[model samples]
Target: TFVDPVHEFAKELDATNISIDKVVGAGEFGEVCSGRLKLPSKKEISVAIKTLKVGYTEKQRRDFLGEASIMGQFDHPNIIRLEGVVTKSKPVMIVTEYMENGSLDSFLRKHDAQFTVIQLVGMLRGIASGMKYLSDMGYVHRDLAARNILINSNLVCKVSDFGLARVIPIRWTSPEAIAYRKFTSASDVWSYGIVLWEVMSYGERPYWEMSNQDVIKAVDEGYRLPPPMDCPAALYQLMLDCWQKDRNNRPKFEQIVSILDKLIRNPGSLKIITPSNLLLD
Candidate 1:
């Protein structure tokens, strides 16, 4: 008896309310820009706007806006805020609060290994807290990788892109997820492990230079990534925990957050670095 809206849970905003400044980058199938959005009470704020490209295909349209509905229901400091969507006029757009520092993976690489363990742990904790919230709500972020996280100027990292299927990043994905497409909260936790390695290495490529086929074969054979240079032994242990083959055996996001919180509180706990080569194992 009721008609459903095309974009559910996402608030509709007039196109006139959006002021595009410049093209910043590309979205899944559109151009992303830095812009300003005007709302009630004359409040205009910085925003990142992703416009559905002209003459787009149905697949592009669906993939681009599909996550907005899911993202609309989430409100957390560690999750990117969807300001609203612009669909009443041409160039439909998805607007979000602008993150000054941009994507986490690229940001970390620019200053490779520059941050202290506590700083890295703080970022990891924020990510885990966000994932915990999503999992608590019975949602699974099928695509949980470092590039999907955005960092603000204040050094706050927030999860963006509520899971929409895409060309898979095989190296970041877990064994079962890669083999069977068995996406679940646990699979996300597995990707979180690779993200942990990325942070510790300041964004070094996981399983560097290995072909996707070889990486797949290697992981299938129980090969886990080695710790990054100077990575703390305790943090590496957490990474290993997330990489557990049985998805059910993986650490939950809450546990990961608590573990990181304690490590952050006790600086000495993260002081022991992994040995490059053990004299006696």
Candidate 2:
């Protein structure tokens, strides 16, 4: 179940005595609101306030905090930077770096049709590089879908929304989480395939309105979205490998970064072409 973020955002800001300009955007778990606050140096800093629901259960709250903590652990040019946490309020707010253009999903939706293959490769490389960083730190972004990747005005991609991220054990998943079949790096690779498809297809819907349960079942049965004819065969195959049901079969994020880097540098050599022109109205 999803909670409306405005309710929590307002409540948190009111408690913090901060004035909000407006809600800029929202995601699966929260909303981003622009605001200002004076610091000890008498400098007013612009901030994006990410508010989690107030009525969230203990488990939900823990998940929210867990995500924030993991995001705070990340500090890189390609990763969205976390500013600080405002936990003194009822619904906690996480302050983070703001991207003017919003999520990569929205950005691609607006301009993907016009994007050159090289540009798309660059976008993919940016995201994969960020993922590489997280993987190096023993983290897996269990949700690396396009909607969680943000692009700035200059088209710099920053990985964000670490709500479902987790640190991986040196070699594998913990026995307890594995017993529960919780998230893992393999799950993240599955999501990354969807993200790559989104990039190649210009923000196309993952399953074209399929029910969640059906999508899950289909995925478990080795089903995947078919690739566009114009998509590079190697790239398409890589995405399929990412979504392989066997976790051990998926490539590491570092490997993915390398592949994408090569693809970006030699896009023409791969002979990729644009797929059908489907207008999204």
Candidate 3:
């Protein structure tokens, strides 16, 4: 059963008002579908509906509903907005705004280098701003990554998939998070560093061809990923700072936003440095 606060913020949606269009993705509970939501205003808007599969256990139901609970409290433009939820009905669902371009990773893979450095930095700025909001609100994403960030038709990036640490891409996870399960805003900064590499590399995999065990071992030994091909020296330096072994060394999301803001303002500051030069740093 839905608890107070979560129940208070998430409205009960009428099943009839939602028209599931097609399967967009999958979650731990079940399939995520693209749909149209008919609002009281007599207008329909595109939405992404995450539904719990039939025969779900009590734990699964609670876990499935948790994302809605967290999302309901967020009101940032860079964070995915929760439209409402349908918990009173069978196959409980959570509805959110649909992003046409889909996940940041896939979007970058499809349109690699189509965006200028400033444009790519703008996407990171939006994500950092979103993280800044969550940090300020005392919430830890725990699973921050390029794949967890959704891109819209307008090329706006919004952070999504809050809560839980399941199915986390090993490469994007911080060493401390992997070793001790310590998930903090600082750990999130580490993940954001990996996302920075993704954006700079146009969605290339971090530590390509490296296994999870290798990543953990390498990170433990102070081995950081070399800057991606053509990655700006300034941006790569920021990523290295985020991957610091000591969590205290990682910059806060506010600091990251400030740095990206400066880069955006002075596009020339994002100068590309060769991997050889990065190796020397």
Candidate 4:
């Protein structure tokens, strides 16, 4: 059954109550701004507001609000929380909990090697758990990557920027998804492998300097990405499993969570392999 989000989840907000502070990010259809949301009780809170750009067409407005609609259906600690939306007036906005650290990619790059192996694995575990929840709900995040994950003030990672599946980077997309536009949980898993590489490499670009066509051709030729420098052997193996040529061989999100759980429990199992050995593998 298709749920009409505009009817079921859209919440009208008083424009005067929302004071847009500064531009924090940008999306395909709008700009995401840091702002203050004043409740009717006179309480105020910081929030991230995604607002449609001025002079938007009706189609653009509809597309922009669709993300809020999808987010409204999800309720998980590891997933970004949707506060509400403003649809009844100008400056249509989708409000969500403000992530203090911003995108996971930028966070890792800014503090490279500052996190221990266990900490990196913990972040991956959080992402996998979030994906597990989404998979159970039959939602496939076609654009899963470090850039799409956000970090909160407590350094907790949460999955965000999902559902729209627009403007996906070639390096993170799966072979099937790139070739046939066939997105499924398996494809999401493939992208998850690339994200794993990103985390382990401290936000290094996947297949550095490879043209999009070359990446597609190389993957088709069974050339998976080499393990990132200082990556744990076990974690890299899991990534290999995720990038199997046969999609059916990919691990389910449930299995991914279980594997990550074991690694978390037995932190000693994580061991960095030599970069030379990693490349040979």
- Per-candidate TM-scores read 0.91, 0.74, 0.90, 0.90
What CA RMSD would you report for each candidate? 3.7, 7.8, 3.3, 2.8
Give, for candidate 4, the lowest lDDT window spanning 10 residues.
272-281
What's the C-alpha lDDT at position 142 in model 4? Answer: 83
Which prediction has more favorable TM-score, 2 or 3?
A: 3
Which clashing pairs does model 3 show?
none
Name the candidate, 2 or 4, with the larger TM-score value.
Answer: 4
Rank the models by lDDT, top first: 3, 4, 1, 2
Cα lDDT computed for each candidate against the true fold? 0.83, 0.68, 0.85, 0.83
lDDT per residue as tens, model 3, 202-278: 88877887767877787888888787777788998999999899999899999999999999888888875643212
lDDT of 3 at 206: 79
Across 150-253, the per-residue lDDT of candidate 1 in tens digits comes to: 99988888999875632188988889989988887888899899999888888777887788998888888788888788889998889888989888999999
lDDT of each residue in 1-281, candidate 4, tens digit only: 12434537656677888888888677787787898999789999889988889999998887787877777777888989887888888778888888999999999999988999988988998899888888777787788989999988877888998555322678888888889887888998999999999999898878888778988888888888887877788998999999988899999999999999999898888964633222322
Residues 1-281 of candidate 2: C-alpha lDDT, one tens digit per residue: 11211222222223344557888786445676877755555667666677787576777666666666677666788888766666766667767666777788878888757877778878888888887787777786656778889887788898997765555321112222334655766666667777888888888777767666555555555567778547877778887788666778789888898888887677666784323222221
TM-score of 3: 0.90
Worst 10 residues of 3 by lDDT: 272-281
Task: Look at candidate 2 and tell me the lDDT of residue 203.
Answer: 84
Give candidate 4 misplaced runs (Cα > 4 Å). 1-5, 25-27, 39-44, 163-168, 272-281
Which residue pairs overlap in candidate 2's backbone? none
